[PDB]
């Protein structure tokens, strides 16, 4: 799986409160986090399904 899947979630500098998903390699699942709305990193998905299809098993 891509290494970006191992990066911690990144909220960013913007101040929106948008729910996004990131892959948590420690748990092996995609979890939710608050995204600020701009400058998202790649371990940031709009659905748990997209996240698991991209990072599952990393």
């Amino acid at each position: 799986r891509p290494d970006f899947c191992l990066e911690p979630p990144y909220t960013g500098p913007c101040t929106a409160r948008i729910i996004r998903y990131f892959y948590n390699a420690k748990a092996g699942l995609c979890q939710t986090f608050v995204y600020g709305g701009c400058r998202a990193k790649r371990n940031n998905f709009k659905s748990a399904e997209d996240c698991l299809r991209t990072c599952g098993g990393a």
Partner: protein, 239 residues
């Protein structure tokens, strides 16, 4: 516009609870489940101005006349969005031109707790040092959002003073304020930064971005409405 039926009482991290309904243009942007993700400002009965990075869609809703989001009994207006007008010049990389207009499906019913904020003229000049106000339901600590609407008074900063920290990240459609002990934070984006113009509260900025930890000693960055108001007027006229 710009004149609340309920006068606000002054004296967001380190802000204070606002007098209920004293910022009648403040709206909460929520998804279909009622989840608050951004703020916004009513500019008339059919339009709301917010930030482009909020990514509002027609599935989201505009909630007007709200004060306590933890109160299920509180009377509010859940307004559907007919169309979203994101400024085509919004730069997703630099965050410049961070503004979006929302056209409501059904007009909002203005009242004592729901009314519009005034818009400035593209040529308006709001001096640095001017004490303005920002409001919203964003985090009060960098955590869940406060139930009740918060407010904070803060000074506009000159571009020279802002750049002393943010350097070249400050673009032409941005204006800074803060670094004075208060800070906008997650959930405040899209909300207003208002200053009085001939006694009327006028939208000078839109909560945009800033310190990654919502530091109260760092300049907050807002979309500069004077640089974007012509786009606003043109959009309304054509729609």
């Amino acid at each position: 516009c710009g004149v609340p039926a309920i006068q606000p009482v002054l004296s967001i991290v380190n802000g204070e609870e606002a007098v209920p309904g004293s910022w009648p243009w403040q709206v909460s942007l929520q998804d279909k489940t009622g989840f608050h993700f951004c703020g916004g400002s009513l500019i008339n009965e059919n339009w709301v101005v917010t930030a482009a990075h909020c990514g509002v869609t027609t599935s989201d809703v505009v909630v007007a006349g709200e004060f306590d989001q933890g109160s299920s009994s509180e009377k509010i207006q859940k307004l559907k969005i007919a169309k979203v007008f994101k400024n085509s010049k919004y730069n997703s990389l630099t965050i410049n031109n961070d503004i979006t207009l929302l056209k409501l499906s059904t007009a909002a019913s203005f009242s004592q707790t729901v009314s519009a904020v005034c818009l400035p003229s593209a040529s308006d000049d709001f001096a640095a040092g001017t004490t303005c106000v920002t409001t919203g339901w964003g985090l009060t600590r960098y955590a869940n959002t406060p139930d009740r609407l918060q407010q904070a008074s803060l000074p506009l900063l000159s571009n020279t003073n802002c750049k002393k920290y943010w350097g070249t990240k400050i673009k032409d459609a941005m204006i800074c304020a803060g670094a004075s002990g208060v800070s906008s934070c997650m959930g405040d984006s899209g909300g207003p930064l208002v200053c009085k113009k001939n006694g009327a509260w006028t939208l000078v900025g839109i909560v945009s971005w800033g310190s990654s930890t919502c530091s109260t000693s760092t300049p907050g960055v807002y979309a500069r409405v004077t640089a974007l108001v012509n786009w606003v007027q043109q959009t309304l006229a054509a729609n």
